[PDB]
């Protein structure tokens, strides 16, 4: 994960709760953009898929290019009312059943 424990200050759109829970830290800073907020490309793709499962919503590369900053991202994804015509993916590794004693 990123950093241990929890903290909150004020009130922010629930997009920020998705980010802090999926990046495993005490809170995300409002001025930062998806390409940095995701940390890694497979982790941004993971965040995209798991947000689509938590919220019912795609984040298209359009708004990740023209508005990736989390307040502006939440405002654009509300205004453009994303109908999320995607399918799904899974990321979780299977667990062991017979290779060990």
DSSP 8-class letter at 48: H
Calpha distance 76→66 (Å, rounded) = 9
33 beta partners: 69
Calpha distance 63→74 (Å, rounded) = 10
* Runs of H (alpha helix) within the chain: 15-23, 34-37, 41-55, 61-66, 70-79
Number of residues written out for the chain: 101
Residues sharing a CB contact under 8 Å with residue 74, sequence separation 6 or more, in sequence order = 13, 15
Maximum alpha-carbon separation in the chain: 56
Q: Residue 28: name the closest of 19, 36, 39 by CA.
A: 19
Tally of CA atoms within 13 A in the half-sphere of 22 that contains its CB: 25
Check: CB of residue 70 under 8 Å from CB of residue 63. no
- Domain range summary for the chain, segments of one domain joined by +: 1-101
Method of determination is NMR
- Helix, strand, coil shares of the chain, percent, nearest 5, are 45, 0, 55
């Amino acid at each position: 994960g990123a950093a241990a424990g929890v903290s909150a200050a004020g009130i922010e759109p629930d997009l920020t709760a998705i980010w802090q829970a999926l990046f495993a830290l005490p809170a995300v800073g409002r001025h930062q953009d998806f390409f940095a907020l995701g940390g890694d490309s497979q982790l941004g793709l993971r965040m995209l898929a798991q947000l689509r499962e938590r919220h019912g919503v795609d984040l298209p590369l359009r708004c990740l290019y023209e508005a990736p900053t989390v307040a502006r991202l939440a405002e654009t994804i509300v205004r453009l009312a994303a109908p999320a015509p995607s399918g799904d993916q899974d990321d979780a590794s299977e667990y062991e059943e017979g290779v060990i004693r």
